[PDB]
Amino acid sequence: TREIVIRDPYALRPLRRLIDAYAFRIYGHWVNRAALFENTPKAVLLSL
Amino acid sequence: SRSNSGVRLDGYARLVQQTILCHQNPVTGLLPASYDQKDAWVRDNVYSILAVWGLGLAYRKNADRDEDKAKAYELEQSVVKLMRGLLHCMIRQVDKVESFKYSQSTKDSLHAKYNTKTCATVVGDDQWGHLQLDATSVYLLFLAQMTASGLHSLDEVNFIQNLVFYIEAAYKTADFGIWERGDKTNQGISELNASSVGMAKAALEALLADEVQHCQSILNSLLPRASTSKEVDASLLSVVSFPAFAVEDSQLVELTKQEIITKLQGRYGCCRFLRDGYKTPKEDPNRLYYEPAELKLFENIECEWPLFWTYFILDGVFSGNAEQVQEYKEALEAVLKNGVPLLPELYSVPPDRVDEEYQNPHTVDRVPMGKLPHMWGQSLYILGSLMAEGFLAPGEIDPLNRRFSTVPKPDVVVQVSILAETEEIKTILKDKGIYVETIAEVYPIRVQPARILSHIYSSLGCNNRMKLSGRPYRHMGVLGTSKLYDIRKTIFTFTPQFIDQQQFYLALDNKMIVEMLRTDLSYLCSRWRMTGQPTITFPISHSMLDEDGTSLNSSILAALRKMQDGYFGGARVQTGKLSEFLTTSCCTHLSFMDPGSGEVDFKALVLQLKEQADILYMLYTMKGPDWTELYNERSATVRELLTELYGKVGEIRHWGLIRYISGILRKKVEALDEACTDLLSHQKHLTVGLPPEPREKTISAPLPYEALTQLIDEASEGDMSISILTQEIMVYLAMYMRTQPGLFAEMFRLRIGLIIQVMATELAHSLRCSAEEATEGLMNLSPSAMKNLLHHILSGKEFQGQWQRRRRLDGALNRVPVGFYQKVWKVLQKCHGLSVEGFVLPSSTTREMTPGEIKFSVHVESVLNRVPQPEYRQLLVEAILVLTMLADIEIHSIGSIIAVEKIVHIANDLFLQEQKTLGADDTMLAKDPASGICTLLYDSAPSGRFGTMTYLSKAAATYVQEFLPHSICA
Numbered sequence A: 001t002r003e004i005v006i007r008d009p010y011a012l013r014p015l016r017r018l019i020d021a022y023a024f025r026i027y028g029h030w031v032n033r034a035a036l037f038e039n040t041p042k043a044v045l046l047s048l
Numbered sequence B: 001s002r003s004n005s006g007v008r009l010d011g012y013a014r015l016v017q018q019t020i021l022c023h024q025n026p027v028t029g030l031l032p033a034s035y036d037q038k039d040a041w042v043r044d045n046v047y048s049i050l051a052v053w054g055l056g057l058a059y060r061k062n063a064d065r066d067e068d069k070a071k072a073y074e075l076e077q078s079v080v081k082l083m084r085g086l087l088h089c090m091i092r093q094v095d096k097v098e099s100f101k102y103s104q105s106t107k108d109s110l111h112a113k114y115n116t117k118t119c120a121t122v123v124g125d126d127q128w129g130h131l132q133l134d135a136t137s138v139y140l141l142f143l144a145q146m147t148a149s150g151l152h153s154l155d156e157v158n159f160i161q162n163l164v165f166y167i168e169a170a171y172k173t174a175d176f177g178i179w180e181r182g183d184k185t186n187q188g189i190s191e192l193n194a195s196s197v198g199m200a201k202a203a204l205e206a207l208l209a210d211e212v213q214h215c216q217s218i219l220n221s222l223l224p225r226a227s228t229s230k231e232v233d234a235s236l237l238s239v240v241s242f243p244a245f246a247v248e249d250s251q252l253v254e255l256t257k258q259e260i261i262t263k264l265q266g267r268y269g270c271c272r273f274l275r276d277g278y279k280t281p282k283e284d285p286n287r288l289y290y291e292p293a294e295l296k297l298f299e300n301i302e303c304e305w306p307l308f309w310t311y312f313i314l315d316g317v318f319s320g321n322a323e324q325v326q327e328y329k330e331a332l333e334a335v336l337k338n339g340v341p342l343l344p345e346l347y348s349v350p351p352d353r354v355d356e357e358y359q360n361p362h363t364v365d366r367v368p369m370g371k372l373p374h375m376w377g378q379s380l381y382i383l384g385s386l387m388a389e390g391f392l393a394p395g396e397i398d399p400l401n402r403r404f405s406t407v408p409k410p411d412v413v414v415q416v417s418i419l420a421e422t423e424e425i426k427t428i429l430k431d432k433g434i435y436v437e438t439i440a441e442v443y444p445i446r447v448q449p450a451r452i453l454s455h456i457y458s459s460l461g462c463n464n465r466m467k468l469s470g471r472p473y474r475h476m477g478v479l480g481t482s483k484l485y486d487i488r489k490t491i492f493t494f495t496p497q498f499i500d501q502q503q504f505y506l507a508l509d510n511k512m513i514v515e516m517l518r519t520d521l522s523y524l525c526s527r528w529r530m531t532g533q534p535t536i537t538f539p540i541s542h543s544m545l546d547e548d549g550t551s552l553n554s555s556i557l558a559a560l561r562k563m564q565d566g567y568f569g570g571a572r573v574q575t576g577k578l579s580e581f582l583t584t585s586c587c588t589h590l591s592f593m594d595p596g597s598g599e600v601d602f603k604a605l606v607l608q609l610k611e612q613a614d615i616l617y618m619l620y621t622m623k624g625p626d627w628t629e630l631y632n633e634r635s636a637t638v639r640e641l642l643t644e645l646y647g648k649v650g651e652i653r654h655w656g657l658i659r660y661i662s663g664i665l666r667k668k669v670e671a672l673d674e675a676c677t678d679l680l681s682h683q684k685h686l687t688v689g690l691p692p693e694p695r696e697k698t699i700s701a702p703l704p705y706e707a708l709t710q711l712i713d714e715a716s717e718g719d720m721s722i723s724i725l726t727q728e729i730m731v732y733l734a735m736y737m738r739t740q741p742g743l744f745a746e747m748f749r750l751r752i753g754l755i756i757q758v759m760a761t762e763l764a765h766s767l768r769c770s771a772e773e774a775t776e777g778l779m780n781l782s783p784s785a786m787k788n789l790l791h792h793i794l795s796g797k798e799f800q801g802q803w804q805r806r807r808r809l810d811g812a813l814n815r816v817p818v819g820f821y822q823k824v825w826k827v828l829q830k831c832h833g834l835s836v837e838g839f840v841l842p843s844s845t846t847r848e849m850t851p852g853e854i855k856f857s858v859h860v861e862s863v864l865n866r867v868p869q870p871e872y873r874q875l876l877v878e879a880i881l882v883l884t885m886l887a888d889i890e891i892h893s894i895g896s897i898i899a900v901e902k903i904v905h906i907a908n909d910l911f912l913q914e915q916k917t918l919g920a921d922d923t924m925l926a927k928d929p930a931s932g933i934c935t936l937l938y939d940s941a942p943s944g945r946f947g948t949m950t951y952l953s954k955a956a957a958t959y960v961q962e963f964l965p966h967s968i969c970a
């Protein structure tokens, strides 16, 4: 429902699978394949 | 043979006589299209005589008695009469062949229609859109085939070779098409149809291989698509199959046939192309053109032509088959006069039944209209029947073995002769181990530059009696300058183009020459489909030696040693003396060559020049623009010392200077129109300047060298050192598309300015420096070093900040995802259009663009990819695809043109709030001085809870919330 896409698109599974697949279609020429994934906010990232 | 095979042959004789030969004019031999259309089309006449030629061949393979000889002779001479009549139709227009030879304009083309009673012209040039390279090419192809089958002045031979030059440049010539209406929109717009290109390739092969393989490049790039404004044309069967067989890729032929079957084939034939509307009940019969808004109307109700199923029987006979389903499905023939099949031209959805057919595709019982019988289709029907019933063989209709195109051709071994320019050079080459022969020793074989070869062909085809002036000066690529030539009984070998072209900085770099040689060898190993083995003459000049002169360049040695080893350039190479290569070479014989501030007074300001060589040059633009070929008052002019400066910096090889001097002296690459024509030959558009849109002038069609060069100059807006970069990068892209075209997949509009900017950025982060000092060190790159940068740009090879770099690399290369354009077609059905930077991609485009067109692609890439910044664009690309992603779950449609940038930005404002809270430095987020998008957003990965595409999903949902008040999502 729209509210879920606005709030947390990723958790909802069906949509995430779509998001991850779209990430690859666009960017799998750059491919652990994890580079195309960002689950850390850059702060916990740039923490070390 | 008269027991049970002569009676059926006589039955087919009655068929051809009562359908085709009854209408042949005894004066001219031409065939009128129908009772209403009394004119004679070139292509229709050529195709309609195929049944007569096949019958004559049948009759002859069994001609022993007189009567049978009489019938065979009558049929063969009817074919000869028709072709001769078409010849005098073309011969009367020798002034048009000559004019089209140099200026390939639609107003200077051979007419398609001719008066069937006088071989004259019926309508004016302006009145039919006469440019149809396929008609002239099919005429030439079947003239070659009929002659090779035994069917017989030199003046008409000269005319035929001038026609070879006429159809020679068909890979870069816009056409009105096989359907003589240009593009689908139907506004008389000349367009490049693969049908014409393939037919021209077949005609040239049957009858210079450089333009042949240029046509081959067009075919590979365009297929399975027909042209720019056509997803698929059923006329492509005339290229991937009988009669051209111009595609040697079996997979490509199968894919084109499958596309035709899946998209155009219906219950009553195959539609010519999607949204054709030639005889649909929705068109205006008395209106010649088509408004862009009525092309939708033609969808799913296009007229199905039985003519194309004759092509599907012909292939199936040419290639053995149980496609006896294409036959037995042609029960849709008019009369069972007496019982004559009378193959119709097309079937149209009955008018009342438009809605049912639209909705339920290929299902309504259509009516036959148009020509009856379609003689072009009827002749192919009779020929296919003949061939299928055993009265004919593929080898009789095709004595030139055009059918054997699809067979894999083995790699060719390019014999190369390395020739020393001088004997000292030969001595150096030997100290290093390459045993060669000097150009003097190779006598009586005479080595000449490729310019001489191009000039020699200008004397081929000349009869001044009918005012025909040879062949236009065309640059001979590696393919042309790889055969040996027998000119006046002495063998002439010609060095490749890239050696004699020493007028731009590319030739000074020996690595460049190595790279050009490698590209030429890679092109040769793949594109040589000629009798003989190709021979590249590679003379080692004095410029190819090192600084001392007692040693050879390392790069040139290494290349020569690899060639001696058999492999260089993806090609197997045999090196040896040129004398050994005579017996196994394409020794073609050229028989036409046989004889028979303050103080504005610039009085004394150049006195400062009389040693840094940079400053000496710098002053020289003040003294050029302010004071270029003007005097210096020391027996010297501004141009002279700039040339002296150019030579000095070439000797010192400080490449920044050479480039600048070249830039202010307006040095231009001679084979640059070839580079642009090659890049456009592969269905890739080009844009030439820095990225804001007006400067970046797009190149949609080939351009002559003067225009191309002039377009480059005005795209720099006077800012020097990019106008040379445009040419150099264009050349490099041409070489890389000739050698590694996979690198150029998912790329359709090469932005040279964005490419240059991304090379500067890469030189800034690799060999870390300022972006500016890097923009200046990009000048100081060797031409081969810059080509390497471009390779690495394309392939994405590396020598927390990564994702910004990628977003930049892909955006500058204008790389789109696979299926991206078709996905954009899908959202345009939902929304009323997309808006990027205020420019609108309206949904009305889909009403005249089928999703798979390379004309809709261009429409999209002109509204989206125009974005200056490299990354903003790649984000706008994501926001479109997340719009595509969420359009499926969304069940409704919105009446707004969606502004993608906002979705990008709304995601931007959603990037500050989330990252600040998860808790990140406020200064960690930095806005862009060009796009206003946080740098960390670019650095973010696509997927994830904090991925950039997820933010756009949280943005598009928060964007269409006010447009779509309610969203019953799936």
Ligand SMILES: C/C=C(\C)CC/C=C(\C)CCC=C(C)C
Pocket (backbone or CB within 6 Å): A001, A002, A005, B827, B830, B831, B883, B884, B886, B887, B889, B890, B892, B893, B894, B898, B956, B957, B958, B959, B960, B961, B967, B968, B969, B970
């Ligand atoms: C169900 C709602 C969403 C998944 C939010 C994102 C979708 C849109 C904002 C509209 C998409 C529809 C188009 C025609 C583009």
